[PDB]
């Protein structure tokens, strides 16, 4: 129990320095400038932002997870989530087995848990995937950029007698041959144009021996903000987890080895929980953006009426300075934690093997981000290893800033206490 301040400052010389800085407007103003520069490093920059790298990493882990396991995943049935007699529904630009499409053609079995994914779930998954892959290919924006958009186009086909997954009821489109329809939804308005075309079995250059319907979806104005893309990634991983369909893998000779070889997708429990946790932490991190913006530190502080600065009365700016500095530190810490959730250096057993042998691997013959080839399947193809590396580099290059943020936080905390 320290009773007296000289005694307390004898033992803790750095506290003495802190008190001296807190009474000095030019040391306070210098810390506030530091916060403006570090905020810009976190929310304005990309490559050198730990926060940017961590967001990218959380999104890449979710996309990579589906690139690994999608080809193995059974799907099928008709539009109500019911079983089908003879429906083949194919989703393009998806990482199928030696294919840039995934085929849902499991009939008779009821869609559901440890069974095929329903086409309704697959459509949700697929849309999120297409959006994420288009954004990753274009490049994610800095965290402060909240109004960019991307355009996304994707297609799927239906064949087989009784297949209703491309019908008016499923699609919204009146004329199954040549009909088109537009709809919007929402604080950003995204416009979707859905169009349909029918190709007869014989007609012109029809590879497949028989007849099908093609659906094209074109989405304009899709928000590519960090928050919006993280919501897409959550939709992707959660749909997988909740639908929990049956899978059965093809293990290569030489290749890395997948255990188990057949099962249900939600059985990858450590993997899925990690990915969800990364997304959760990244959403919390991005959420600090508005705290930072709301408490800008660019206005200089000092006394009033030319009288000396009085740290007990003249410091109503301190609460906002503290909130800004704490929010920055929280961003940095959550960015770190996203990284450590997936970094294989601290993983063990089958989850480590999943990451090092599959997720942080790409078998495309590097292709840009968001590229789906006939060899994507069974590999992450989402720059996971490189993103972990870049996150670590950005953190090492944040050394000064982090100390400046702590010092600003401490100054502000001293002034909030004095003003109590």
């Amino acid at each position, epitope marked *: 129990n320290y009773e007296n301040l000289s005694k307390l400052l004898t033992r803790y010389s750095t506290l003495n320095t802190l008190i001296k800085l807190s009474a000095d407007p030019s040391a306070i103003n210098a810390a506030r400038e530091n916060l403006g520069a570090s905020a810009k490093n976190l929310i304005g920059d990309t490559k050198n932002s730990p926060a940017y790298q961590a967001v990218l990493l959380a999104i890449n882990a979710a996309v990579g997870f589906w690139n690994v396991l999608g080809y193995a995943t059974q799907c099928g049935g008709n539009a109500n989530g019911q079983e089908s007699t003879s429906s083949t529904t194919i989703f393009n630009n998806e990482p199928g087995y030696r294919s840039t499409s995934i085929t849902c053609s499991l009939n008779r079995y009821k869609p559901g848990y440890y069974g095929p994914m329903s086409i309704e779930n697959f459509k949700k998954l697929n849309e999120a995937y297409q959006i994420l892959q288009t954004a990753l290919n274009k490049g994610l924006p800095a965290l402060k950029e909240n109004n960019g958009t991307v355009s996304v186009t994707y297609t799927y086909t239906c064949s087989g007698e009784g297949n209703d997954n491309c019908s008016k009821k499923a699609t919204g489109v009146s004329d199954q041959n040549g009909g088109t329809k537009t709809k919007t939804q929402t604080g950003k308005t995204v416009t979707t144009t859905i169009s349909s075309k029918v190709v007869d079995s014989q007609a012109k250059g029809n590879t497949t021996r028989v007849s099908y319907t093609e659906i094209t979806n074109k989405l304009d104005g899709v928000p590519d903000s960090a928050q919006a893309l993280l919501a897409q990634a959550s939709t992707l991983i959660n749909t997988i987890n909740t639908a929990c369909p049956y899978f059965s893998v093809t293990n290569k000779s030489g290749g890395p080895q997948m255990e188990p070889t057949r099962g249900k997708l939600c059985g990858f429990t450590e993997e899925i929980s990690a990915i969800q946790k990364m997304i959760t932490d990244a959403q919390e991190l991005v959420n600090q953006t508005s705290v930072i913006n709301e408490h800008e530190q660019s206005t200089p502080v000092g006394g009033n009426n030319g009288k000396p600065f009085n740290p007990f009365t003249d410091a109503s700016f301190a609460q906002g300075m503290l909130a800004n500095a704490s929010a920055q530190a929280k961003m940095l810490n959550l960015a770190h934690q996203v990284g450590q959730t997936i970094n294989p250096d*601290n993983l063990t057993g089958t989850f480590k093997n999943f990451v090092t042998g599959f997720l942080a691997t790409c078998n495309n013959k590097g292709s840009p981000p968001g590229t789906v080839t006939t060899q994507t399947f069974a590999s992450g193809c989402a720059y996971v290893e490189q993103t972990i590396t870049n996150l670590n580099n950005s953190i090492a290059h944040f*050394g000064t800033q*982090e*100390q400046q943020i702590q010092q600003a936080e401490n100054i502000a905390d001293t002034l909030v206490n004095f003003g109590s």
Partner: nanobody
Amino acid sequence: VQLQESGGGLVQPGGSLRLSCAASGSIFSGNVMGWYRQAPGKLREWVAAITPQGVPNYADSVKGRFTISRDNAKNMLYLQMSSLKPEDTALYYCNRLPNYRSWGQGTQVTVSS
């Protein structure tokens, strides 16, 4: 768990010293690690950092004179200091980046004729 620096001492300007830092597995493994110093009348200053894969970077005040390294098999961090100057006098500390909240005791470096 913990952070334990050693190797400090009083030396002559122009001299050299090697600092060591023993870190627990949980602090060190898969983490960026770094050195810091706190000089009289000042707050703690960052000095150098090193990624798990071994990429070093440095504050301008020490670049070209100090070398940071890590030994991943033993959870040890090192700072080789050369061409030391009076201005390098300080308590030196290691930590991960971002920092674990409880610092070790640090090791005193004093440079003086």
